[PDB]
């Protein structure tokens, strides 16, 4: 299969036509996505098979072929870019200043950008192009708009 680094669409042929259920990042031979996109199922890349390696429903993350590789973090000050990959649409970078999700266990960055459900797994990047987290797990605020957490795993 294609192991080249980059952003990939996660597709299915189970439903009507070819449907995009999410997005992910290939880095250092490992495919990273959100748990709710694949529910931990195996993936296909051409003729090759990608088997899950690590996952966690609470963090809402999963890695394939190896351990989670992404460890860059939002610095808490600078603007970032959502590299949105919407269903049937070209990859597009959107710049934004993240807000904050304050929890009983600490704070996390959050991006107030609204996209179709099948955009889950799109990477959020810093100015060096490093992936600081994935887009697609968050909350709906008073005005009905969507705010996603900047979800990052841990590199062992």
């Amino acid at each position: 299969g294609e192991t080249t680094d980059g952003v990939y669409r996660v597709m299915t042929r189970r439903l009507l036509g070819s449907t995009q259920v999410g997005v992910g990042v290939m880095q250092e031979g490992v495919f990273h996505t959100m748990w709710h996109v694949t529910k931990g199922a195996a993936l296909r890349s051409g003729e090759g098979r990608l088997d899950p390696y690590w996952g966690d429903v609470k963090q809402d993350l999963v890695s394939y072929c190896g351990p989670w590789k992404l460890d860059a973090a939002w610095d808490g000050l600078s603007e970032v870019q959502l590299l949105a990959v919407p269903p049937g649409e070209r990859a597009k970078n959107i710049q934004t200043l993240p807000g904050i999700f304050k929890t009983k266990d600490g704070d996390i960055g959050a991006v107030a950008l609204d996209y179709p459900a099948g955009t889950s797994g799109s990477p959020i990047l810093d100015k060096c192009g490093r992936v600081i987290g994935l887009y697609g797990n968050g909350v709906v605020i008073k005005n009905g708009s969507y705010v996603s957490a900047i979800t990052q795993g841990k590199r062992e």
């Binding site: 996660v10 609470k58 929890t103 990047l125």
Partner: protein, 39 residues
């Protein structure tokens, strides 16, 4: 069966469209990975 298709490189775009606000929200994270607003 799910499959992947390449969609692009991961690179910062100089002069990309700048949008979205920066809300500071009190949230809770449950065992199922669902975020919710705390009031």
């Amino acid at each position: 069966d799910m499959y992947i298709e390449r969609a692009g490189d991961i690179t910062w775009e100089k002069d990309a469209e700048v949008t979205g606000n920066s809300p500071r929200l009190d949230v809770a994270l449950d065992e199922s990975g669902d975020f919710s607003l705390v009031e």
